[PDB]
Ligand binder design. Structure first.
Ligand SMILES: *[C@@H]1O[C@H](CO)[C@@H](O[C@@H]2O[C@H](CO)[C@@H](O[C@@H]3O[C@H](CO[C@H]4O[C@H](CO[C@H]5O[C@H](CO)[C@@H](O)[C@H](O)[C@@H]5O[C@H]5O[C@H](CO)[C@@H](O)[C@H](O)[C@@H]5O)[C@@H](O)[C@H](O[C@H]5O[C@H](CO)[C@@H](O)[C@H](O)[C@@H]5O)[C@@H]4O)[C@@H](O)[C@H](O[C@H]4O[C@H](CO)[C@@H](O)[C@H](O)[C@@H]4O[C@H]4O[C@H](CO)[C@@H](O)[C@H](O)[C@@H]4O[C@H]4O[C@H](CO)[C@@H](O)[C@H](O)[C@@H]4O)[C@@H]3O)[C@H](O)[C@H]2NC(C)=O)[C@H](O)[C@H]1NC(C)=O
Ligand SMILES: *[C@@H]1O[C@H](CO)[C@@H](O[C@@H]2O[C@H](CO)[C@@H](O[C@@H]3O[C@H](CO[C@H]4O[C@H](CO[C@H]5O[C@H](CO)[C@@H](O)[C@H](O)[C@@H]5O[C@H]5O[C@H](CO)[C@@H](O)[C@H](O)[C@@H]5O)[C@@H](O)[C@H](O[C@H]5O[C@H](CO)[C@@H](O)[C@H](O)[C@@H]5O)[C@@H]4O)[C@@H](O)[C@H](O[C@H]4O[C@H](CO)[C@@H](O)[C@H](O)[C@@H]4O[C@H]4O[C@H](CO)[C@@H](O)[C@H](O)[C@@H]4O[C@H]4O[C@H](CO)[C@@H](O)[C@H](O)[C@@H]4O)[C@@H]3O)[C@H](O)[C@H]2NC(C)=O)[C@H](O)[C@H]1NC(C)=O
Ligand SMILES: *[C@@H]1O[C@H](CO)[C@@H](O[C@@H]2O[C@H](CO)[C@@H](O[C@@H]3O[C@H](CO[C@H]4O[C@H](CO)[C@@H](O)[C@H](O[C@H]5O[C@H](CO)[C@@H](O)[C@H](O)[C@@H]5O)[C@@H]4O)[C@@H](O)[C@H](O[C@H]4O[C@H](CO)[C@@H](O)[C@H](O)[C@@H]4O[C@H]4O[C@H](CO)[C@@H](O)[C@H](O)[C@@H]4O)[C@@H]3O)[C@H](O)[C@H]2NC(C)=O)[C@H](O)[C@H]1NC(C)=O
Ligand SMILES: *[C@@H]1O[C@H](CO)[C@@H](O[C@@H]2O[C@H](CO)[C@@H](O[C@@H]3O[C@H](CO[C@H]4O[C@H](CO)[C@@H](O)[C@H](O[C@H]5O[C@H](CO)[C@@H](O)[C@H](O)[C@@H]5O)[C@@H]4O)[C@@H](O)[C@H](O[C@H]4O[C@H](CO)[C@@H](O)[C@H](O)[C@@H]4O[C@H]4O[C@H](CO)[C@@H](O)[C@H](O)[C@@H]4O)[C@@H]3O)[C@H](O)[C@H]2NC(C)=O)[C@H](O)[C@H]1NC(C)=O
Ligand SMILES: OC[C@H]1O[C@@](CO)(OC[C@H]2O[C@H](O[C@H]3[C@H](O)[C@@H](O)[C@@H](O)O[C@@H]3CO)[C@H](O)[C@@H](O)[C@@H]2O)[C@@H](O)[C@@H]1O
Ligand SMILES: OC[C@H]1O[C@@](CO)(OC[C@H]2O[C@H](O[C@H]3[C@H](O)[C@@H](O)[C@@H](O)O[C@@H]3CO)[C@H](O)[C@@H](O)[C@@H]2O)[C@@H](O)[C@@H]1O
Ligand SMILES: *[C@@H]1O[C@H](CO)[C@@H](O)[C@H](O)[C@H]1NC(C)=O
Ligand SMILES: *[C@@H]1O[C@H](CO)[C@@H](O)[C@H](O)[C@H]1NC(C)=O
Ligand SMILES: *[C@@H]1O[C@H](CO)[C@@H](O)[C@H](O)[C@H]1NC(C)=O
Ligand SMILES: *[C@@H]1O[C@H](CO)[C@@H](O)[C@H](O)[C@H]1NC(C)=O
Ligand SMILES: *[C@@H]1O[C@H](CO)[C@@H](O)[C@H](O)[C@H]1NC(C)=O
Ligand SMILES: *[C@@H]1O[C@H](CO)[C@@H](O)[C@H](O)[C@H]1NC(C)=O
Ligand SMILES: *[C@@H]1O[C@H](CO)[C@@H](O)[C@H](O)[C@H]1NC(C)=O
Ligand SMILES: *[C@@H]1O[C@H](CO)[C@@H](O)[C@H](O)[C@H]1NC(C)=O
Ligand SMILES: *[C@@H]1O[C@H](CO)[C@@H](O)[C@H](O)[C@H]1NC(C)=O
Ligand SMILES: *[C@@H]1O[C@H](CO)[C@@H](O)[C@H](O)[C@H]1NC(C)=O
Ligand SMILES: *[C@@H]1O[C@H](CO)[C@@H](O)[C@H](O)[C@H]1NC(C)=O
Ligand SMILES: *[C@@H]1O[C@H](CO)[C@@H](O)[C@H](O)[C@H]1NC(C)=O
Lengths: 624, 624
């Protein structure tokens, strides 16, 4: 095993465990110290204003198993510190018959048991567990634990009658899944249900959704309501909140609803951020976010979706969330988005970016798998004065349209997403910032034009505004992590409405994924404008490439170039001519970003271990 | 619910939990503070000379489940003190994927991990588990833990490759069971295997048996040897030590070998106690003790047996224990005998006495189930100068015979059992002792003759020597726990060789067992004697009746009379005449015995709990 990045890669499968630990590793984002991670969990803003972030964790392994909550905290979403206790950076782990198979996703009741922050989580035990398997009742239940030390440790309620697990009966037969409890307060839902509380007797101020589905009949989000305020044992099933069909798709802008939901959440937003009104705010919109499985041919069969919904009250005192429009939270290699409330009327969302090594060829050599996305403020994106001649505008796929009285303009409403400002400020302020001169891409434009200032490593941000003609057939974008022999190309093609990441040359190492990523982006044309604009921001962080367009579209992916000099970046141009010109302005390079884990050394591997021959006997975990 | 014991019992099923806690409860023996107990485990003499006793325990329940090690200690086998830690009187409990289904029986390596006492125990996980079920490999494994504080707590080795569990591969296919590791040192087995260690490479000073069997083909005791001295991870399977047939019986004196062994142990004894020679002591005998299941129509389908064995070395460097003769360790409601070495060349054995409420009618009202037997010294019982005309002597069923050179006398050898002298001394010294005048039972003998001194409560011992004519057809014995309306009759009938406990009148409460207990007792007739003698000792301890005959035969049973005055005792006589006389001498009553748990209050119930609806979902434990 040679680690010479000035020559072609050898056979890297001969390299030892964690020998490639630093090679492709993100430095500027949330990531476990080592080993396997997946979904964010247990997210909450603590009493001191800091952010507690949990995550599904399997230390010293590079596949999922014994799944536990790893945790850390931050005052600004950006610079983090690990918890350190008797189980290292873990704070909840399998320990009881009811959760011994895994401590799955859960969410926080901020004022819970004895007034302490309390997690409601999926406690798993033995048996087939999966949407394509024959799961039985009891395998997935929901349990409580609380913290008296602000997340350094958690105390589970006892096992038994009237204690853990607190939710165990399947609300409908033949479930595909029954997990990922999302606890939330909702003045909106309380107001809607207030006239029906005699029917159900459920009058608490917390609601909980549980994600699942029904075999052969599509996904389901089940709604529960806390039976009595201040009491956390009894949760009353109201009914299904979201019901979708078996592999139903709302269309090209909306992914596919698959067969089963995972990590679903419920929020209410307005143009500024989170909305906590009872329905009285006419600018507020109710949203559900959710993962779906088995409705996609690639990306691990997983879509991270969202939908705007209109609530209807059923006669039995439950709520039907009728989907008004439906979109995609991230179009790339990410899943398991969780959102949580933050002071100042914010709702903040974060997901998990998996690797692109699905055959597990270099995972042991990495010594870790997975990272988070960046933390994103959610809000209602409103675009005013939109031209009715915007192509496809009245499909209203992942947006709504409201005509002006005179019919000459349209107001567009959709889900907005933007990186939390704390992170953008910290990134910019800690970076070497190069403000670049605007560039007209015309007949003289090369295919690739390096920026006048270049990155110094694999940790940088790019921004640019691309102005296109209304009838352009030109393509433009950014090339990143680039040398002569390796590069990753981010293209937007207004004629097709497709944002792509072409990865055929991303790496000389052939075992990593190289498929083309694709997102749809609607450029809402403004009344009186003779052009249409794409605002593109790109974060490069080790192997993560995370793309944001117009505070709306997100696409996370992976690139693993071998050569030490595959760090460059610049502009891409295709079919730009004297007549079909792309004007690029607001160009900026931020070189360096932030060291997100200042207390961690460069190599936080502790080695990898094997569970031994019993892993296959138990059949629950891969064992490595 | 009335608790008036001066009138007939009402419907006691209406009584609350633990309302009958003290009513039938032993006071003079080892018993858990409350709840469910079964097999003794983790028995060892600590460095300070005290005895550590563990037991299978399910606190606050009256059926088996979440099975754990409860523990206590004693300086004299007799007066005990509970451990008290973070889990009360528990010291090992289910906590890892490999043992979450139960911490089953285990035994002690006195100088184990880092020189500390170390337990090797059966760690159980999910799946069908039982001799009549389709068990799979992994469900039962064997794991290590060690104590740095003399049994107050235990630290398990980590889960994984080269750590716990340490034994997991089935040594043969289609096992009926794979549990109850019995670790022991054996100069005898080391000497026998010394010429074969090149074949196996196993040269350690500890051996371990694991109890089981093969579906359709009878029970098996599997022998392992520690691979290397001072190292405790690697144990090498040598071969089957004991192999018996599917429901094979050696005969009327030997129970039945069933389909599967449980709690088997290996020892070597001589007339004084434990023998630690390499084979050079010609008075020493190798013994195996073992439970069998499914070879009995009653007594929970369980026989606690023993066998004298002659070891043969196989060509592959393993040992066949060939059964020379075979007997019964206790003929009544007891099982799961464990033996352990004690200083002064002793081997001490103790078992579990279950209740006689198999339909679980009053278990909740008790608030507990189970106790230990008394602790018993094992030794080789040798009877000299036995008459060759002793009926059935040369069947050699559960004994051996050696003729004198002239053929006029026989030396009989069998397994001896007697109550440890520490307990007999403490019992006698703390009791009100009545030495009774000898009684000739003849034509004037009533059916029942109360002793001249009577017990004052349900805690007493009786002793007597019954001298019978060589051709008697008379029966005699002891009646205990007796009033006019309730009593329990212990008879010996030399003509049939049967010792019986008739329980048709033991209690007015009809839900308890009332079947007649039966043991075979061989009165070895002495050359020149014109009579044959039965030495009978009986311990009455709450509901336990524990009978010892001739330091050889043991029979433990249960009686639950309701009336407060059903405490009396005396002599039984049937068919005694002027010509067929039974002389009773050495008669003694010890009233009171010892308070075995001086620190415990009378009622140590903590209430009972229900596991809730998930118990049936998991299907592992009853849940109460
Ligand atoms: C199979 O068997 C298993 C083993 O028995 C069993 O698991 C056990 O289950 C029991 C019962 O559910 C659990 O017991 C509970 O424990 C809770 C605390 O748990 C935390 O702390 C314990 C103990 O902590 C000590 O010891 C450890 C070990 O040495 C140390 O490391 C600690 O530092 C600490 O040491 C100090 O204390 C020791 C003595 O205890 C000293 O020896 C020592 O010197 C130190 O001073 C830990 O062991 C726990 O860790 C385990 O669990 C966590 C997850 O929780 C895991 O991450 C970890 O790996 C371990 O597995 C944990 O950290 C107790 O809070 C709980 O007690 C209460 O609830 C019961 C039941 O309701 C009540 O009876 C009791 O009164 C308590 O309730 C009151 O208090 C709470 C708030 O404190 C209130 O909410 C409540 O309303 C009530 O209030 C009352 O009092 C108030 C006034 O005070 C009043 O105002 C109110 O009005 C009201 O009256 C309970 O004891 C036990 O933890 C499990 N153990 C393990 C190892 O798993 C398993 O379930 C069984 N399985 C099956 C299938 O049956
Ligand atoms: C799923 O995830 C699960 C959670 O991660 C996982 O379970 C965990 O597995 C790990 C790995 O196997 C276990 O870690 C081991 O722990 C052993 C100690 O275990 C006892 O103590 C711990 C911790 O004790 C503290 O904290 C608790 C909780 O607060 C307190 O209550 C205690 O009082 C105590 O607190 C003090 O310390 C804290 C910091 O730790 C402080 O915060 C605090 O302020 C106090 O000061 C307990 O938690 C354990 O309880 C659990 O387990 C028991 C059963 O054992 C249960 O009954 C109970 O309910 C709990 O479940 C327990 O009491 C360590 O000994 C062990 O460490 C060693 O081994 C590793 C691996 O080999 C070595 O790397 C390491 O060096 C150690 O080995 C050396 O030391 C031993 C002797 O000490 C030698 O034999 C050995 O050769 C070696 O010696 C070396 O050093 C010598 C010099 O020192 C030198 O001479 C030699 O040459 C040599 O170099 C390891 O850390 C962990 O306990 C599990 N936790 C739980 C909760 O289960 C589970 O397996 C996962 N499942 C799957 C399927 O993957
Ligand atoms: C005295 O000790 C006991 C512990 O032994 C304490 O707890 C009680 O324990 C018994 C078991 O011994 C429980 O009985 C079972 O109850 C089931 C129904 O429970 C629901 O209704 C009752 C009555 O209103 C409620 O009290 C329960 O509420 C509690 O539990 C819920 C969770 O469900 C919590 O949220 C609450 O807070 C409470 O903690 C429940 O709502 C019942 O289904 C179960 O069923 C079987 O029971 C008997 C068996 O003899 C049969 O009649 C019946 O046919 C079922 O039989 C089964 O038999 C076999 C083997 O099991 C199966 O193969 C069959 O298919 C069949 O299912 C049983 O009756 C009792 O609920 C529980 N009480 C509690 C927790 O409060 C007592 O509290 C304690 N007393 C005191 C004063 O301390
Ligand atoms: C680097 O990290 C790893 C952890 O990832 C550390 O541990 C190693 O981990 C790998 C797994 O990544 C283990 O590989 C597996 O080994 C099995 C055979 O093991 C035995 O032989 C080896 C080689 O001589 C010994 O080292 C082992 O000894 C250890 O374990 C025993 C317990 O058995 C202990 O007592 C010892 O003390 C040691 O701890 C063993 O004796 C092998 O069967 C297993 O098999 C599959 O493996 C690959 C998969 O790619 C295939 O080639 C093969 O066909 C099998 O494939 C499976 O694939 C699928 C899915 O799993 C199944 O459906 C198929 O049916 C098929 O079974 C695998 O190769 C390795 O043993 C282990 N080493 C240890 C513990 O020492 C490394 O130590 C660490 N390195 C360093 C320097 O720290
Ligand atoms: O960590 C569990 C949480 O992640 C989510 C969202 O992704 O589910 C993931 C899947 O978890 C389990 O799958 C594991 C499987 O059992 C194991 O055999 C191996 O293949 O690894 C899998 C995970 O990579 C579960 O069985 C699946 O049904 C589930 O999709 C979230 O829903 C969970 O809270
Ligand atoms: O406590 C386990 C130890 O006791 C022994 C000797 O008696 O085995 C007893 C039995 O334990 C298990 O049985 C339980 C069963 O699983 C459960 O469903 C319920 O019925 O209660 C049973 C015990 O009463 C085990 O499954 C059986 O196979 C076993 O006979 C000893 O061998 C164990 O170490
Ligand atoms: C990048 O590195 C490779 C290999 O060392 C080299 O061929 C190339 O000239 C380097 N410089 C570039 C692409 O600017
Ligand atoms: C790479 O090395 C592996 C062993 O890790 C070997 O099996 C494989 O054939 C090698 N690939 C080559 C030489 O292309
Ligand atoms: C309420 O009605 C809906 C629609 O029929 C149904 O799916 C749900 O199960 C009902 N809720 C309850 C608690 O029965
Ligand atoms: C919205 O405006 C477009 C363009 O003026 C028009 O075609 C459509 O009919 C209008 N919709 C409504 C509801 O008026
Ligand atoms: C650098 O980043 C840190 C950590 O996020 C932040 O607190 C600090 O303000 C940043 N420095 C600047 C903006 O100069
Ligand atoms: C644009 O994307 C869609 C998928 O939404 C695809 O069908 C179409 O072929 C793409 N067209 C181009 C030119 O990239
Ligand atoms: C024993 O108690 C019962 C019921 O109180 C009574 O009938 C009997 O006379 C009492 N005395 C005896 C049997 O000596
Ligand atoms: C005893 O009480 C139980 C209820 O605990 C009742 O079901 C049973 O019929 C009663 N037996 C009688 C009256 O004999
Ligand atoms: C040794 O031989 C016996 C008798 O054939 C056999 O049962 C046992 O499995 C053998 N041992 C090993 C380790 O193969
Ligand atoms: C043992 O003694 C009995 C009675 O004398 C006799 O029948 C039997 O043959 C003797 N056995 C041997 C081996 O001499
Ligand atoms: C009474 O019993 C205790 C506890 O076993 C014992 O130590 C003591 O010697 C006994 N008293 C006597 C024999 O007088
Ligand atoms: C004595 O016990 C045996 C069982 O070993 C039985 O077959 C026989 O009937 C009994 N005889 C008498 C008289 O009790």
């Amino acid at each position: 095993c040679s680690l010479d990045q000035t020559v072609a890669p050898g056979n890297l499968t001969l390299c030892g465990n964690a020998t490639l630990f630093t090679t492709f590793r993100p430095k500027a984002r949330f990531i476990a110290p080592e080993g396997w991670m997946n979904a964010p969990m247990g997210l909450y803003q603590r009493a001191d204003g800091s952010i507690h972030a949990g995550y599904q964790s399997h230390p010293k392994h590079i596949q999922w198993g014994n799944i536990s909550q790893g945790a850390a905290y931050s005052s600004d979403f950006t610079s983090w510190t690990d918890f350190n206790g008797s189980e290292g950076y873990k704070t909840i782990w399998p320990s009881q018959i009811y959760d011994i198979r895994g401590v799955f996703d859960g969410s926080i009741i901020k004022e819970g048991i004895d007034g302490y922050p309390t997690i409601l989580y999926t406690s798993t035990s033995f048996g087939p567990l999966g949407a394509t398997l024959n799961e039985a009742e009891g395998t997935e239940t929901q349990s409580l634990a609380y913290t008296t030390d602000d997340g350094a440790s958690w105390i589970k309620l006892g096992y038994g009658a009237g204690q853990n697990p607190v939710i165990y009966e399947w609300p409908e037969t033949n479930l595909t899944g029954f997990r990922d409890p999302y606890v939330f307060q909702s003045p909106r839902l309380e107001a809607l249900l207030a006239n029906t509380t005699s029917i159900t007797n459920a009058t608490g101020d917390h609601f909980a959704t549980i994600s699942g589905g029904v075999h052969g009949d599509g996904a389901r989000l089940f709604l529960y309501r806390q039976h009595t305020t201040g009491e956390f044992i009894k949760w009353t099933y109201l009914g299904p909140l979201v019901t979708t069909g078996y592999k139903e798709s709302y269309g090209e802008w909306s992914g596919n609803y698959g067969i089963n939901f995972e990590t679903a959440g419920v929020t209410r937003l307005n143009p500024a951020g989170a909305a906590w009104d009872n329905g009285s705010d006419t600018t507020a919109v109710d949203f559900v976010t959710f993962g779906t499985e088995q409705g996609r041919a690639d990306h691990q069969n997983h879509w991270p979706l969202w939908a705007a919904v209109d609530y209807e009250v059923r006669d039995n005192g439950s709520i039907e969330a009728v989907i008004a429009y439906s979109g995609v939270q991230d179009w790339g290699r990410s899943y398991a988005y969780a959102s949580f409330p933050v002071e100042g009327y914010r709702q903040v969302s974060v997901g998990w970016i998996y690797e692109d090594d699905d055959n597990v060829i270099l995972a042991k050599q990495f010594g870790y798998q997975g990272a988070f996305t960046l933390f994103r403020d959610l809000f209602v994106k409103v675009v005013e004065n939109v031209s009715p001649s915007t192509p496809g505008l009245f499909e209203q796929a992942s947006w709504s349209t409201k005509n002006s009285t005179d019919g000459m303009s349209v107001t567009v409403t959709t889900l907005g997403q933007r990186v939390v400002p704390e992170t953008l400020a910290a990134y910019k302020g800690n970076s070497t910032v190069s403000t670049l001169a605007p560039v007209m891409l015309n007949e003289s434009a090369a295919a690739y034009t390096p920026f006048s200032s270049q990155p110094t490593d694999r940790f940088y941000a790019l921004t640019g505004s691309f102005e296109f003609g209304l009838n352009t057939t030109a393509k433009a974008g950014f090339r990143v992590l680039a040398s002569e022999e390796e590069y990753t190309d981010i293209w937007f093609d207004p004629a097709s409405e497709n944002l792509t990441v072409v990865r055929t040359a991303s790496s000389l190492i052939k075992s990593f994924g190289n498929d083309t990523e694709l997102a749809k982006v609607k450029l809402y044309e403004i009344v009186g404008a003779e052009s249409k604009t794409l605002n593109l921001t790109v974060f490069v962080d080790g192997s993560v490439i995370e793309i944001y367009a117009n505070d709306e579209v997100a696409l996370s992916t992976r690139a693993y170039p071998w050569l030490a000099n595959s760090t460059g970046a610049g502009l891409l141009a295709d079919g730009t001519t004297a007549g079909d010109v792309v004007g690029v302005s607001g160009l900026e390079l931020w070189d360096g970003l932030v060291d997100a884990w200042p207390a961690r050394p460069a190599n936080t591997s502790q080695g990898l271990v094997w569970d031994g021959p019993t892993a296959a006997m138990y059949g629950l975990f891969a064992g490595y």
